[PDB]
């Protein structure tokens, strides 16, 4: 919804494609965003395995290849991303409270 395609969440994320873009936005009177294709690649799915005896816990991360990242779509519900800073929008640290792709009641997520 926002534009992170420039990769704002860190200024460290600039490639000449962004630079090429800036020089074009200078010599251009107008633009169209023709297509935007996003591809996620999952190299690992890693849970933290918590082994708990009473009053103690042993922590280890372990690969789960039987699990997977859920890419949720909210197609039933009106929702918003809060945005503050170019960093505030990041595929990682960006969240909304009391939000779960799984509701005990009506799971509104495709």
């Amino acid at each position: 919804q926002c534009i992170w395609w420039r990769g704002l969440q860190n200024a460290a994320n600039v490639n000449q494609t962004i630079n090429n873009m800036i020089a074009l936005n200078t010599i251009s009177y107008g633009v169209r965003f023709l297509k935007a294709k996003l591809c996620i690649e999952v190299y690992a799915v890693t849970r933290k395995r918590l082994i708990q005896t009473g009053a103690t816990s042993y922590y280890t991360d372990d690969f789960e290849q039987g699990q997977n990242l859920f890419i949720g779509w909210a197609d039933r519900k009106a929702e918003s991303i809060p945005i503050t800073t170019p960093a505030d929008l990041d595929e990682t640290k960006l969240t909304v409270a009391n939000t779960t792709l799984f509701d005990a009641n009506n799971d509104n997520i495709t």
């Binding site: 297509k35 294709k37 799915v45 933290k48 859920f70 890419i71």
Partner: protein, 55 residues
């Protein structure tokens, strides 16, 4: 959908830029884990991934 706006073109001129365009619902997108109750709350998953976004 139907755009009606005024672009300045400096002080002496204006442009009543005015178009129609097709409506795009953009849902919300999220990357989340399975919710699995453990003995204590949820299991905690952390995904190594590479997003690839080209425009």
């Amino acid at each position: 959908e139907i755009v009606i706006a005024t672009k300045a073109i400096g002080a002496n001129e204006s442009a009543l830029v005015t178009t129609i365009q097709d409506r795009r619902s953009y849902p919300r997108l999220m990357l989340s884990q399975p919710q699995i109750k453990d003995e204590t709350d949820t299991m905690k998953f952390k995904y190594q991934i590479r997003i690839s976004t080209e425009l």
